[PDB]
Design a protein around this ligand. Structure first.
Ligand SMILES: Cc1sc2c(c1C)[C@H](c1ccc(Cl)cc1)N[C@@H](CC(=O)NCCCCCCCCC(=O)N[C@@H](C)C(=O)N[C@H]1CCC(=O)NC1=O)c1nnc(C)n1-2
Ligand SMILES: [Zn+2]
Lengths: 126, 385, 824
């Protein structure tokens, strides 16, 4: 119940600032941020006020685009796959908790399609 | 009930949120009375369309988009089944809906169709067949709508025919202009009641104009700000408009749809209006939200109308000044706003945590309605003892 | 179901009357229209001599006399309610009299809504066309030539859609009309010029002017003066283009003038009649301007006296005036130069009986023989009375009441009648207790007043003003021998009496009068209070036994096997008469309609409303509750309903129609068994008010094996009384064939087809008649010649065996028709 998302700027873990990481920091992140739908997925879900006393039970790891942008700006990620996986779990931890057809679920799916078309053009290996 | 509304009550009629460059049509088609026709029915729709009422739609499934595209060319009309007899596809009556707006988008490679349609003639469901494509083409018989002459048109004396044209009604709505005028109107119109076995007030109880006047009186008593301008003058359109705005359950709406006479519909609406008390949460069944006195109209289509969410789901929203036992969840948003100029949070029953409706708060400081609520029809239970 | 409908009394009300030279060039005739009957008289010094009476297949709406150039006598133009038009001529060949149709046609529009001020028909003074106004926004013109034998007409569009009255003007070189219409700015008078070549309106001779807001009548003054006279609520005005004259006499302010007639051929004098029986004279004064031209100097009105409430007026000759009335008896009056002791210039000469309107009736046997008698509630206002009809022709005895009778019932033990009456009183000064004239309720032997206090805190807003009219309802006890009012009981203020019944309830050996009322207030629309009162009449004094206050209006009450069945608002309730002489509710049934009509036979209850919603209920004895058996909801206007048999029901519908519903209990599914099937349609032509079981013939003997079963009598607004009886299939088929072959030799006046006349008609749909046999057409079979009989009965087969009696001889059908004629 109410654990903070993965800590920003893991000091022990080494970091490389690659062009793929900068693409993630700007074109993916900002475009996802400025969306009419990405307004719930941008602050750590608060189940106490939204009053959903079980999410943290069904959800093992909580996270949001806010904390992931913070982790992207403060040196955290050694590579990109970590960040893509983190966003994928951010999608999954909603499809699994809510039921098919609902509204949050129908919103995310749109975000996930946007994300996929965005990241299929990630930079060549550098 | 502030003191004035400075909001253009003609704005929540065009549905600006849906789009702007709508492809409009003009051709109006009514087939006939008492014939049998086969017409497609849109799935996923759970509502009863009263004639004259508008219906916005957003469609995503390929079959619905394809059949709407085909229907645009042929006749531009489909069927909206009542679907109210239980919920297991039991249908007896329905309403014909005609499309007058159409546009298509591309989105993420998925075709999206936005359609605004209006209600039309009623029918009865005779036989229903299901097609492999998905469209449940059905055989229906168009119910006839009939007007009746005056009750005295048969017993009236010929010498008093020249006295059947009354002077213009006074415009200063007040005593000695309403009471006296209506008394003289009753005395002069039903003078030939002495030639029959029934009194004058009995015949006035079946007079269309008197019934419309009483309904207008009660509507203005609920909505003081509402003026006698938007309401139609024809009995049929007036009856349909009144029916399409009463916060009632589904059975009463079905029974009003079954009626084929304007006078009978007006009398039934008067009875229902005299009976309505308040509304309660559907799931909790006891939590009371708001009363009929708080119902007010921000649109020229009445206090109640149908809008479409950003995802395709259609909600019938009732505008009220205040709401109780509601908790708001989320941050005020100003996109796909149904009332241009306001923002919408999401409201949910404070007990069962079920969605009742939204709270629309004004952005500009100089707007007389600063906060008004919206309540979904299929989330409230009419609390009539 | 097969039914036979015949008339016993022809309609007596008068809706039109004209004068002229119809029968001969040197004879003065009076023509009177009575719904479907037309009567022709010759005016003599002694009085009126009947000459000819004919029947038409329709209700006469327009009747005018005109003389086209080249004719030696007037022609008659007639238009019926179904828009059948004709031109008729009178021919006398030796001693035989016939009426020839010189032109006929149906002037109807396939699309259009009927106008609000009714049907208007006018004729050009020079006989050049006929102007009709049937629908709003159109004016129909029929050229009057010798070749227009089909009465072909064309329509001219009118930009004014609220025409009140319209007339043709005298002295115009081209056909000119003058009319009054209403627009949002008020009422104006215009004028047009009708062109028969280009078929359109031209600019009129005068200029549009403003008139009084209550102007309703237009009178076309003859040639010497010219112009038109407009009569309003408080003023009379004369327009002649440039000349103008207006007077506002105070005499004509009390009541609205509704009819007029011209006395002098030059327009010097006119007769005016209002809605209260007053008769006025309007005089036109002439002056000469030493140029040979005569101009109108002034106008003046004078009160002549009082007559019956007039529908039409006609000055005959020598000061004799015919007064045609719909609510009372017609009259012949005499105008004297001098006045009597009361200043009245009118003197009654003759009176003609009128039974209409009939609002209630009952069948009794006063002489205790096998022959019944019919007692009806007739007339209205000061012309109301009681009429006793015997089958002795019919012998009618009149008992004037000077009130409006509403209900009537008979109590054999007390040897008296119970009548619900109503009189109009005006609110003068302190209180509204001023009576217009002495009435039966006021002039009674004994009297009593309701002293109930059940509703003392009732609404009663006291919104009363000076001169306001209030209705007072009374219960009158009338002796059955002398027909004198023995007792008059007055109900509470603002109380309306609706129903009356006489019956015995429970184990009580006494007979009671039971009345159901309703408290009515001007500001409320639907009553919320009511009362049921039990009266006992003994020793010559009326006494109240018990009273029960209900929460609605008691529209109907029926005795139900020793119990009282009452209709309160939209609820049917059953009561019991306990040993404490009270009423105790047993069961209630809640419907969705107002139970205006309540009939009972055995254990079945028929419930109906004003919108033709028929509901059938049954009583469950072991359970003590009601159940619904069948229903039939079809929107229309219904006037009355009756129970013919255990499964057949008869009702009167809108547009003067009759219908019969049937219940089929042999249906397989419960849905087919729960619906009523229409099995009879018929266009009667009259507005039925009341149905009742009974007969006027010596049915006590009853002979043996009557061809007809049952007997039902009904009374109409026009004073017509008819009879309905049931038939068998064989007789129905034979009579249908007889009607079909009879409508090929009878010459109808106006050449109207019988099937069109009897077709079930309404403004939505028209359907041919079914299940009804027209008894008048069958009875007309005896009045034709023997060769016509032989032609009619040619190749008809009937009867039991013997090769269907070969071909039916005319004598067989003669005997059959004579047997049928004995039922009334
Ligand atoms: C801060 C966070 S984090 C977060 C949510 C939040 C508020 C959410 C959550 C739920 C729903 C939304 Cl939409 C957003 C966020 N719920 C949780 C799960 C949860 O408690 N579910 C319970 C749903 C209760 C009723 C919800 C339907 C209401 C329909 C609705 O209002 N639909 C919109 C499109 C609509 O009708 N608009 C109208 C308004 C009038 C107008 O003018 N225009 C329109 O079209 C959630 N799941 N994962 C995450 C991330 N969250
Ligand atoms: Zn709840």
């Amino acid at each position: 119940m109410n654990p903070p998302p993965p800590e920003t700027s893991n000091p022990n873990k080494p970091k490389r600032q690659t062009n793929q990481l900068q693409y993630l920091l700007r074109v993916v992140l900002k475009t996802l941020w400025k969306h009419q739908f990405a307004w719930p997925f941008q602050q750590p879900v608060d189940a106490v006020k939204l009053n959903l006393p079980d999410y943290y039970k069904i959800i093992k790891t909580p996270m949001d685009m806010g904390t992931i942008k913070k982790r992207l700006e403060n040196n955290y990620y050694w590579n990109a796959q970590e960040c893509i996986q983190d966003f994928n779990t951010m999608f999954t931890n909603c499809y699994i908790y809510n039921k098919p057809g609902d509204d949050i679920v129908l919103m995310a799916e749109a975000l996930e399609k946007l994300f996929l078309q965005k990241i299929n053009e990630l930079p060549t290996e550098e | 009930k502030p003191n004035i509304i400075n909001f253009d009550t003609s704005l929540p009629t065009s549905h600006t949120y849906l789009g702007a460059d709508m492809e409009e049509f003009h051709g109006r088609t009514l087939h006939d009375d008492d014939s049998c026709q086969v017409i497609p029915v849109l799935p996923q729709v759970m509502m009863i369309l009263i004639p004259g009422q508008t219906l916005p739609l957003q469609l995503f499934h390929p079959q619905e988009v394809s059949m709407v595209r085909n229907l645009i060319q042929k006749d531009r009309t489909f069927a909206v089944l009542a679907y109210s007899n239980v919920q297991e596809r039991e249908a007896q009556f329905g309403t014909t809906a005609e499309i007058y707006a159409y546009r298509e988008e591309q989105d993420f490679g998925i075709e999206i169709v936005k359609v605004k349609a209006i209600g039309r003639q009623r029918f009865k469901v005779l036989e229903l067949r299901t097609q492999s494509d998905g469209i449940q083409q059905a055989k229906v018989q168009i119910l006839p709508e009939c007007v009746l002459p005056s009750t005295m048109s048969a017993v009236q004396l010929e010498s008093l025919n020249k006295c059947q044209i009354f002077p213009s009604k006074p415009v200063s709505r007040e005593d000695q202009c309403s009471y006296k005028w209506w008394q003289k109107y009753q005395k002069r119109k039903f003078h030939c009641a002495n030639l029959t076995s029934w009194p004058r007030w009995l015949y006035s109880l079946y007079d269309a104009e008197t019934l419309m006047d009483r309904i207008k009186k009660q509507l203005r008593e609920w909505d003081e700000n509402l003026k006698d301008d938007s309401l139609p003058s024809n009995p049929i359109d007036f009856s349909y408009r009144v029916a399409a705005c009463l916060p009632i359950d589904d059975v009463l709406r079905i029974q009003l749809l079954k009626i084929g006479s304007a006078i009978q519909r007006l009398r039934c609406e008067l009875d229902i209006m005299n009976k309505c008390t308040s509304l309660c949460c559907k799931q909790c069944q006891e939590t009371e939200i708001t009363t009929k006195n708080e119902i007010f109209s921000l649109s020229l289509c009445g206090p109640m109308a149908a809008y479409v969410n950003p995802h395709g789901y259609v909600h019938e929203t009732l505008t009220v000044y205040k709401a109780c036992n509601l908790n708001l969840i989320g941050r005020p948003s100003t996109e796909h706003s149904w009332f241009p100029g306001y923002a919408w949070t999401v409201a949910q029953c404070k007990i069962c945590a079920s969605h009742i409706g939204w709270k629309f708060t004004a952005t500009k400081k100089d707007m007389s309605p600063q906060k008004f609520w919206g309540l979904t029809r299929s989330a409230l239970l009419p609390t009539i003892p | 179901s097969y039914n036979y409908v015949v008339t016993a009394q022809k309609p007596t009300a008068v809706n039109g009357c004209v004068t002229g030279h119809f029968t001969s060039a040197e004879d003065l005739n009076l023509l009177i229209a009575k719904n479907t009957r037309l009567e022709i008289y010759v005016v003599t010094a002694e009085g009126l001599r009947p000459v000819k009476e004919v029947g038409m297949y329709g209700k006469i709406a327009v009747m005018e006399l005109f003389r086209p150039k080249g004719e030696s006598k007037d022609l008659l133009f007639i238009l019926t309610a179904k828009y059948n038009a004709c031109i008729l001529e009178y021919k006398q060949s030796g001693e035989s009299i016939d009426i020839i149709t010189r032109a006929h046609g149906n002037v109807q529009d396939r699309i259009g809504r009927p106008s609000e001020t009714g049907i208007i028909g006018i004729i050009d003074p020079e006989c050049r066309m006929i102007g009709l106004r049937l629908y709003d926004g159109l004016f129909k013109v029929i050229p009057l030539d010798r070749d227009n034998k089909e009465l072909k007409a064309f329509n001219i569009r009118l930009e004014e859609l609220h025409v009140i009255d319209v007339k043709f003007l005298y002295g115009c070189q081209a056909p000119t009309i003058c009319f009054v219409y209403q627009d949002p700015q008020g009422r104006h008078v215009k004028t047009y010029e009708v062109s028969l070549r280009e078929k359109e309106f031209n600019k009129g001779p005068w200029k549009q002017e403003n008139v009084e807001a209550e102007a309703s009548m237009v009178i076309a003054v003859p040639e010497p003066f010219g112009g038109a006279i407009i009569i309003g609520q408080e003023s009379i005005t004369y327009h002649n283009g440039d000349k103008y004259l207006a007077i506002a006499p105070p005499i004509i302010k009390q009541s609205t003038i509704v009819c007029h007639n011209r006395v002098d051929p030059n327009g010097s004098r006119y007769l005016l009649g209002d809605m209260e029986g007053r008769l006025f004279m309007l005089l036109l004064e002439k002056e000469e301007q030493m140029d040979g031209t005569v101009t109108l100097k002034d106008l003046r009105v004078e009160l002549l006296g009082e007559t019956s409430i007039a529908e039409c007026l006609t000055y005959l000759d020598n000061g004799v005036v015919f007064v045609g009335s719909r609510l009372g008896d017609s009259q012949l009056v005499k105008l004297n130069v001098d006045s009597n002791e009361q200043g009245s210039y009118v003197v009654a000469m003759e009176t003609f009986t009128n039974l209409g309107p009939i609002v209630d009736m009952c069948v009794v046997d006063l002489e205790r023989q096998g022959q019944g008698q019919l007692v009806t509630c007739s007339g209205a206002f000061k012309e109301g009375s009681l009429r006793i009809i015997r089958n002795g022709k019919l012998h009618i005895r009149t008992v004037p009441l000077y009130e409006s009778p509403r209900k009537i019932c008979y109590q054999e033990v007390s040897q008296c009648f119970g009548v619900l009456s109503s009189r109009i009183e005006v609110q003068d000064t302190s209180g509204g207790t001023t009576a217009l004239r002495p009435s039966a309720s006021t002039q009674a032997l004994s009297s009593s007043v309701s002293s109930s206090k059940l509703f003392s805190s009732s609404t009663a807003p006291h919104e009363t003003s000076f001169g306001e009219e209030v209705e007072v309802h009374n219960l009158l006890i009338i002796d059955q021998h002398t027909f004198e009012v023995l007792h008059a009981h007055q109900f509470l203020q603002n109380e309306y009496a609706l129903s009356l019944v006489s019956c015995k309830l429970g184990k009580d050996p006494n007979t009671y009068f039971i009345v159901g009322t309703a408290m009515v207030y001007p500001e409320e629309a639907e009553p919320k209070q009511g009362r049921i009162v039990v009266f006992q009449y003994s020793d010559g004094k009326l006494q109240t036994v018990a009273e029960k206050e209900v929460k609605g209006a008691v529209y109907s009450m029926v005795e139900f096997n020793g119990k009282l069945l009452a209709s309160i608002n939209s609820t049917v309730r059953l009561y019991e008469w306990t040993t404490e002489k009270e009423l105790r509710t047993e069961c209630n049934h809640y419907n969705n309609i107002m139970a205006l009509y309540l009939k009972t036979k055995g254990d079945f209850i028929l419930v109906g409303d004003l919108m033709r919603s028929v509901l059938l209920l049954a009583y469950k004895p072991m359970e003590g509750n009601f159940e619904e058996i069948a229903r039939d909801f079809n929107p229309n206007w219904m006037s009355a309903v009756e129970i013919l048999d255990d499964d057949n029901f008869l009702g009167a519908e809108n547009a003067f129609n009759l219908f019969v519903c049937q219940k089929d209990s042999a249906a397989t599914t419960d849905e087919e068994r729960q619906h009523l099937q229409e099995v009879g349609l018929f266009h009667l032509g009259e507005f039925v008010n009341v149905f009742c079981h009974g007969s006027l013939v010596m049915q006590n003997l009853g002979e043996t094996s009557t061809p007809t079963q049952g007997s039902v009598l009904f009374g109409t607004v026009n004073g017509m009384i008819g009879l309905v009886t049931s038939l068998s299939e064989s007789w129905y088929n034979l009579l249908l064939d007889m009607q079909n072959r009879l409508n090929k030799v009878i010459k109808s006046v106006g050449k109207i087809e019988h099937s069109f006349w009897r077709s079930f008609h309404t403004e939505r749909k028209t359907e041919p008649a079914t299940g009804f046999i027209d008894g008048d057409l069958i009875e007309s079979f005896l009045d034709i010649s023997r060769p016509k009989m032989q032609e009619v009965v040619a190749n008809l087969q009937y009867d039991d065996g013997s090769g269907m009696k070969r071909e039916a001889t005319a004598d067989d059908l003669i005997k059959v028709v004579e047997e049928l004629t004995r039922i009334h």
